[PDB]
Every structure is written in structure tokens, then in C-alpha cells.
Design an enzyme around this catalytic site. Structure first.
Site, PDB file in Angstrom:
ATOM      1  N   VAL A  27       0.840  -1.196   0.000  1.00 42.68           N
ATOM      2  CA  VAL A  27       0.000   0.000   0.000  1.00 42.68           C
ATOM      3  C   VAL A  27       0.871   1.240   0.000  1.00 42.68           C
ATOM      4  O   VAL A  27       0.392   2.337  -0.271  1.00 42.68           O
ATOM      5  CB  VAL A  27      -0.973   0.046   1.203  1.00 42.68           C
ATOM      6  N   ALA A  31      10.040   6.654   5.205  1.00 40.87           N
ATOM      7  CA  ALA A  31      11.470   6.661   5.505  1.00 40.87           C
ATOM      8  C   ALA A  31      11.918   5.443   6.315  1.00 40.87           C
ATOM      9  O   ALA A  31      13.068   5.030   6.241  1.00 40.87           O
ATOM     10  CB  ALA A  31      11.855   7.974   6.225  1.00 40.87           C
ATOM     11  N   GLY A  33      10.156   2.231   6.736  1.00 41.04           N
ATOM     12  CA  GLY A  33       9.782   0.887   6.294  1.00 41.04           C
ATOM     13  C   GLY A  33       8.756   0.907   5.177  1.00 41.04           C
ATOM     14  O   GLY A  33       8.354   1.974   4.722  1.00 41.04           O
ATOM     15  N   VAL A  35       4.937  -0.861   3.735  1.00 45.73           N
ATOM     16  CA  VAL A  35       3.697  -1.347   4.326  1.00 45.73           C
ATOM     17  C   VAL A  35       2.906  -2.154   3.304  1.00 45.73           C
ATOM     18  O   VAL A  35       2.804  -1.767   2.135  1.00 45.73           O
ATOM     19  CB  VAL A  35       2.830  -0.173   4.919  1.00 45.73           C
ATOM     20  N   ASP A 165       2.179   6.951  14.038  1.00 51.53           N
ATOM     21  CA  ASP A 165       3.492   7.553  14.282  1.00 51.53           C
ATOM     22  C   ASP A 165       4.123   8.077  12.971  1.00 51.53           C
ATOM     23  O   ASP A 165       4.619   9.218  12.913  1.00 51.53           O
ATOM     24  CB  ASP A 165       4.414   6.601  15.053  1.00 51.53           C
TER      25      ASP A 165
HETATM   26  N1  LIG Z   1       3.306   3.077  11.205  1.00 53.20           N
HETATM   27  C1  LIG Z   1       2.934   1.781  11.184  1.00 53.20           C
HETATM   28  C2  LIG Z   1       3.337   0.930  12.200  1.00 53.20           C
HETATM   29  C3  LIG Z   1       2.963  -0.423  12.197  1.00 53.20           C
HETATM   30  C4  LIG Z   1       2.185  -0.929  11.165  1.00 53.20           C
HETATM   31  C5  LIG Z   1       1.774  -0.075  10.142  1.00 53.20           C
HETATM   32  C6  LIG Z   1       2.134   1.289  10.151  1.00 53.20           C
HETATM   33  N2  LIG Z   1       1.780   2.141   9.168  1.00 53.20           N
HETATM   34  C7  LIG Z   1       0.571   2.209   8.573  1.00 53.20           C
HETATM   35  C8  LIG Z   1      -0.592   1.738   9.189  1.00 53.20           C
HETATM   36  C9  LIG Z   1      -1.811   1.813   8.509  1.00 53.20           C
HETATM   37  C10 LIG Z   1      -1.880   2.366   7.229  1.00 53.20           C
HETATM   38  C11 LIG Z   1      -3.236   2.423   6.489  1.00 53.20           C
HETATM   39  O1  LIG Z   1      -4.197   1.804   6.931  1.00 53.20           O
HETATM   40  C12 LIG Z   1      -3.367   3.134   5.152  1.00 53.20           C
HETATM   41  C13 LIG Z   1      -3.161   4.517   5.062  1.00 53.20           C
HETATM   42  C14 LIG Z   1      -3.285   5.149   3.831  1.00 53.20           C
HETATM   43  C15 LIG Z   1      -3.620   4.410   2.692  1.00 53.20           C
HETATM   44  C16 LIG Z   1      -3.836   3.029   2.783  1.00 53.20           C
HETATM   45  C17 LIG Z   1      -3.704   2.393   4.020  1.00 53.20           C
HETATM   46  C18 LIG Z   1      -0.716   2.831   6.608  1.00 53.20           C
HETATM   47  C19 LIG Z   1       0.495   2.747   7.281  1.00 53.20           C
HETATM   48  C1  LIG Z   2       1.745   6.633  18.334  1.00 54.97           C
HETATM   49  C2  LIG Z   2       1.476   8.134  18.160  1.00 54.97           C
HETATM   50  C3  LIG Z   2       2.622   8.947  18.776  1.00 54.97           C
HETATM   51  C4  LIG Z   2       3.830   8.978  17.839  1.00 54.97           C
HETATM   52  C5  LIG Z   2       4.977   9.826  18.421  1.00 54.97           C
HETATM   53  C6  LIG Z   2       6.208   9.852  17.504  1.00 54.97           C
HETATM   54  C7  LIG Z   2       5.904  10.465  16.133  1.00 54.97           C
HETATM   55  C8  LIG Z   2       7.174  10.590  15.283  1.00 54.97           C
HETATM   56  O1  LIG Z   2       8.075  11.559  15.849  1.00 54.97           O
HETATM   57  C9  LIG Z   2       8.934  12.116  14.876  1.00 54.97           C
HETATM   58  O2  LIG Z   2      10.025  11.188  14.634  1.00 54.97           O
HETATM   59  C10 LIG Z   2      10.941  11.688  13.608  1.00 54.97           C
HETATM   60  C11 LIG Z   2      11.931  10.601  13.140  1.00 54.97           C
HETATM   61  O3  LIG Z   2      12.394   9.841  14.257  1.00 54.97           O
HETATM   62  C12 LIG Z   2      11.645  12.945  14.161  1.00 54.97           C
HETATM   63  O4  LIG Z   2      12.566  13.449  13.176  1.00 54.97           O
HETATM   64  C13 LIG Z   2      10.586  14.022  14.524  1.00 54.97           C
HETATM   65  O5  LIG Z   2      11.180  15.156  15.182  1.00 54.97           O
HETATM   66  C14 LIG Z   2       9.492  13.444  15.433  1.00 54.97           C
HETATM   67  O6  LIG Z   2       8.448  14.413  15.553  1.00 54.97           O
END
Ligand SMILES: Nc1ccccc1Nc1ccc(C(=O)c2ccccc2)cc1
Ligand SMILES: CCCCCCCCO[C@@H]1O[C@H](CO)[C@@H](O)[C@H](O)[C@H]1O
Ligand SMILES: CCCCCCCCO[C@@H]1O[C@H](CO)[C@@H](O)[C@H](O)[C@H]1O
Length: 345
Positions: A27, A31, A33, A35, A165
Site C-alpha cells: 500500500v 522513511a 519501512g 507497508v 506515528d
Molecule cells: N506506522 C505503522 C506501524 C505499524 C504498522 C503499520 C504502520 N503504518 C501504517 C498503518 C496503517 C496504514 C493504512 O491503513 C493506510 C493509510 C493510507 C492508505 C492506505 C492504508 C498505513 C500505514
Molecule cells: C503513536 C502516536 C505517537 C507517535 C509519536 C512519535 C511520532 C514521530 O516523531 C517524529 O520522529 C521523527 C523521526 O524519528 C523525528 O525526526 C521528529 O522530530 C518526530 O516528531
């Protein structure tokens, strides 16, 4: 105990996941990973599976991996990304090199559903309500997001919303600076939690108008457009700026008054205009908090003071530590092993 894994190649990268996850479909990526959407045969729900990219490449990547896993293991709230599963195909620490994370598949983000388009007032209330409900929770654990933007806000078909995040920066088929608090762009190096409320204000405005609130070409242009709306800093704020060069530059500007927000957002629900006026204040100490914003009359149809929970305390003490790459790796491995899945509810 250890599940049986299978291998496949997806966009020039190898995915090794347990059999329980089927029909992996990219999908997008960011930076940190890539998904894939998948079917989770254990629950029958659709999930998002993130494979972290080069998780232990440097001391900094290793610490960043550990930070993300520790954070995601703590989040347990309906409007915040939660961990269904975390796995590695490794049988021991010595071969531990890959980290995969699993969450409920949402299917879209606010980069998409803007459509470059007007949403109705009731849809705005609901979306901004859920954002603030998530932020109340995050902020109660003294975590500040700092990088909130439409792509961090995942939305399903029911218009239910979660804070991610990190969202998708590339979608297998919007500037971040547009949403940044002015103090971030001035490198203040110490932040209020209300840095995130600034971003919410920016997002709420865009949903109501269909237009990016401050579409700067760069941080300087960004600040120029902000000051135009909110005006140059007052004497009260000026007192609180220790930086001589920042103070001298600010004081050297052609001074400007705050605009009338009712004129800027003509046609909008006056309660929304009032709330925007309380988020979009230069001085971060005078911005409304997430907790206060939930109790604003704009959210009267949603607000429930008994269903807006706070978080368990969160230990960020590891942030001040300087460890070897194998120590961050081993700490991350311990977190993979200690993981307890939530109940299937
Ligand atoms: N950050 C992280 C950490 C662990 C697992 C996954 C994630 N990151 C995502 C999680 C959910 C989505 C969506 O559901 C989605 C969003 C936009 C378009 C299509 C689908 C996208 C990225
Ligand atoms: C789960 C919802 C809370 C997420 C808190 C962290 C969100 C990401 O935090 C971001 O991480 C970047 C890369 O490490 C930094 O460069 C940014 O300063 C920081 O805002
Ligand atoms: C054009 C530049 C004006 C921007 C001024 C931003 C003021 C942000 O507000 C400041 O936030 C700090 C936390 O970061 C607090 O320590 C200060 O008390 C608060 O006034």
C-alpha cells in the site's frame, strides 16, 4: 510455539511473515519501512504489516527501531495506532536482523480524503474530535508527536480515525512544513505539547475550506504567511524569547495585527471559527490543550468526559542513553519476545 513462516518478494524486497498473514499487497512506504495490506487468518480482519527498513544499520537506526517498538507497545487507545503483533523470522538474537509490525488496516489517510475538497461541518467535528481524543491520550503520557500532518491520520470507511506515528509518504497508487508549529521552524529545542495543537488547527482549517491554510514554499515563507493571519508577536510573548537574534529580527518586522478570523473563514460554523482562534495562537502557552478542546462547544455532540481516557505513564529515560548497536538490537529483541497480543474483542 514458533509459527511457520513463508517467503515472497515484493517491490525488490523480501517479505518473510507467518502463514497467518495472507494476500500481502503493498500500500506504500516511508522513511522507516514499507507497508502491505494483508488478511489476518487468526481474526479474519484486514491488517497493515510494516517491514522496517534496515532496522539495525547504524546506532541511530537501532535506537529509532527500539523507540518505535517501545512506543507502539504502550499505545492502547481507539484513536491511536495499536500493535496487533510484532514478529521476526529469526530464531535467536544472533540472527536477529528484521522487524515487522502489525496494526488494524485503516485503508486511507487525510492526504486522500481531503480530495482537495470541502467536507461538511459534521464530518469535520467528528474527525477533529477523534484527533484530539487521541492527542489527549498521547499527551497524558508526556509524548509529543511533533510531526502531525494529514498523512499521519489514517481513516477507515466508517470515518473512524487513528493517529499514526509515521504514515505513507509514498502511496502505491502535500508538504510537511505546511503543518509545522512556528516554534519548530525556529528550532526552539524545547517544546510544549501544544505544538501538536497548532498542526490540528492547520488540518481543521483545510477540511473546512478545502484549501491549505499556510502553503509556504519554505520555512521563511511559511512564517510570513502565519504572521499575516495571526499578526506579529505582542509584548507578552516578546518577554519570553531568550534568543537575541530571533528577538531582533521579529522586532524589526513591519508589525501586523491579528486578522478577524470570522472574515478569513466566512461561512464556517462560528463555533469552529472560535476553536480555530484558540488553537492558532503564536504563543504556545496560550494555545488550547487537547483536554480543553474536547470540552469546547463545537464538540457538544461527541464530548463525553467519562470516555476520553488518559494513558499509563511512559518511561522515556532510554532517550538520554548512548549505547552500542548490539545493545539497542538486544533491547529491541527483548521487546519482540515479551510482546503480549491484545485479546480478540
Ligand atoms: N506506522 C505503522 C506501524 C505499524 C504498522 C503499520 C504502520 N503504518 C501504517 C498503518 C496503517 C496504514 C493504512 O491503513 C493506510 C493509510 C493510507 C492508505 C492506505 C492504508 C498505513 C500505514
Ligand atoms: C503513536 C502516536 C505517537 C507517535 C509519536 C512519535 C511520532 C514521530 O516523531 C517524529 O520522529 C521523527 C523521526 O524519528 C523525528 O525526526 C521528529 O522530530 C518526530 O516528531
Ligand atoms: C515569527 C516567530 C514567532 C513564533 C513564536 C513562537 C512562540 C512559541 O511559544 C513559546 O513556546 C515555548 C515552547 O517551545 C515556550 O517555552 C514559551 O513559553 C512559549 O511562549
Amino acid at each position: 510455539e514458533r509459527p511457520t513462516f513463508y517467503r515472497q518478494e515484493l517491490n525488490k524486497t523480501i517479505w518473510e511473515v507467518p502463514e497467518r498473514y495472507q494476500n500481502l499487497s503493498p500500500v506504500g512506504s516511508g522513511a522507516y519501512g514499507s507497508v502491505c495490506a494483508a488478511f489476518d487468518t487468526k481474526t479474519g480482519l484486514r491488517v497493515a504489516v510494516k517491514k522496517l527498513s534496515r532496522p539495525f544499520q547504524s546506532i541511530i537506526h537501532a535506537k529509532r527501531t527500539y523507540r518505535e517498538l517501545r512506543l507502539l507497545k504502550h499505545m492502547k487507545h481507539e484513536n491511536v495506532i495499536g500493535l496487533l503483533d510484532v514478529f521476526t523470522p529469526a530464531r535467536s538474537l544472533e540472527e536477529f536482523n528484521d522487524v515487522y509490525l502489525v496494526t488494524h488496516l485503516m485503508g486511507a489517510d487525510l492526504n486522500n480524503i481531503v480530495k482537495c475538497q470541502k467536507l461538511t461541518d459534521d464530518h469535520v467535528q467528528f474527525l477533529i474530535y477523534q484527533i484530539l481524543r487521541g492527542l489527549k491520550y498521547i499527551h497524558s503520557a508526556d509524548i509529543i508527536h511533533r510531526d502531525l500532518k494529514p498523512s499521519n491520520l489514517a481513516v477507515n470507511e466508517d470515518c473512524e480515525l487513528k493517529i499514526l506515528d509515521f504514515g505513507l509518504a509514498r502511496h502505491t497508487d502535500v508538504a510537511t512544513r505546511w503543518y509545522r508549529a512556528p516554534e519548530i521552524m525556529l528550532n526552539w529545542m524545547h517544546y510544549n505539547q501544544t505544538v501538536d495543537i497548532w498542526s490540528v488547527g492547520c488540518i481543521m482549517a483545510e477540511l473546512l475550506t478545502g484549501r491549505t491554510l499556510f502553503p509556504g514554499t519554505d520555512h521563511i515563507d511559511q512564517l510570513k504567511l502565519i504572521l499575516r493571519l495571526v499578526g506579529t508577536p505582542g509584548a507578552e510573548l516578546l518577554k519570553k524569547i531568550s534568543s537575541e537574534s530571533a528577538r531582533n529580527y521579529i522586532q524589526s518586522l513591519t508589525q501586523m495585527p491579528k486578522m478577524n478570523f470570522a472574515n478569513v473563514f466566512i461561512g464556517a460554523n462560528p463555533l469552529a471559527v472560535d476553536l480555530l482562534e484558540k488553537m492558532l495562537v503564536l504563543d504556545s502557552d496560550k494555545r488550547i490543550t487537547a483536554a480543553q478542546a474536547l470540552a469546547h462547544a463545537y464538540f457538544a455532540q461527541y464530548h463525553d468526559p467519562d470516555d476520553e481516557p488518559v494513558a499509563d505513564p511512559y518511561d522515556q529515560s532510554f532517550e538520554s542513553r548512548d549505547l552500542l548497536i548490539d545493545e539497542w538490537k538486544s533491547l529491541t529483541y527483548d521487546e519482540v519476545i515479551s510482546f503480549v497480543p491484545p485479546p480478540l474483542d
